[PDB]
């Protein structure tokens, strides 16, 4: 029922690593401050996403048992989760509580950033469905770890080794769901259910980026490796 001393140690360690990320307020203050052109926003995106990959590699390396896994499986896990992790992180920031009108302005500024209409609705639909779970910082941190350590990712040679690392994180999240939401015993499965809608973003990330209303889609050598653009 309650977290064991080992699980509490694990949760605090995941939290410290997750807190090493770019501050959510810094990101929203910039978007809310002034409206930018589609070219300016594409460049902001390119810089934010490059930094995110760097932070994600550091977060991943600290995941218990990750560095004991086969090197090629390590690359396969990172490539498989990078885009999902950025959308989960973007979903977290989008649902952070702000003063009156700010969230409507944030949404309107993102809606006009340059992305094609085709991708705006599937994106805000995912963000709002994330918000309905009223997730805590710990739930976001554990879900990111769970997303990274997915055994059913393509090109993984040893699934069972990945399975063994994901299982203790799934147990910690399950216990937190029961503690944080005792009235709703469905909460854990609802949280896991959101991972399938996250997976759909991998199929159309490349198009979502190429369809951006800009004359030239210039990416960084790190984004070219992780995104396949």
């Amino acid at each position: 029922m309650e977290l064991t001393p080992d699980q509490q140690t694990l949760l605090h360690f995941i939290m410290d690593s997750y807190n090493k990320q770019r501050m959510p307020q810094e990101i929203t203050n910039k978007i809310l401050k002034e409206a930018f052109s589609a070219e300016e926003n594409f460049l902001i995106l390119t810089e934010m996403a490059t930094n995110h990959v760097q932070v994600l590699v550091e977060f991943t390396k600290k995941l218990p048992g990750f560095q004991t896994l086969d090197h090629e499986d390590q690359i396969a896990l990172l490539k498989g989760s990078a885009v999902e992790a950025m959308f989960l992180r973007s979903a977290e920031i989008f649902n952070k509580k702000l003063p009156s009108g700010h969230s409507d302005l944030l949404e309107a500024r993102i809606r006009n950033s340059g992305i094609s209409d085709e991708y705006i609705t599937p994106m805000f639909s995912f963000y709002k469905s994330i918000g309905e779970l009223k997730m805590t910082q710990e739930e976001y941190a554990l879900l990111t770890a769970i997303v990274i350590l997915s055994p059913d990712r393509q090109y993984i040679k040893d699934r069972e080794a990945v399975e063994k690392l994901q299982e203790p994180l799934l147990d910690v999240l399950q216990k937190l769901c029961k503690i944080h939401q005792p009235e709703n015993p469905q909460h854990f499965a609802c949280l896991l259910g959101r991972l399938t809608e996250l997976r759909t973003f991998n199929h159309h990330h490349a198009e979502m980026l190429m369809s951006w209303r800009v004359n030239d889609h210039k990416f960084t050598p790190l984004l070219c490796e992780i995104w396949d653009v």
């Binding site: 760097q54 590699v57 390396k61 090197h71 690359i75 990172l78 490539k79 790190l222 490796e225 992780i226």
Partner: peptide
């Protein structure tokens, strides 16, 4: 193939 990713991983 994934040179930068591998580099950041093996650091």
């Amino acid at each position: 193939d994934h040179q930068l990713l591998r580099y950041l991983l093996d650091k």
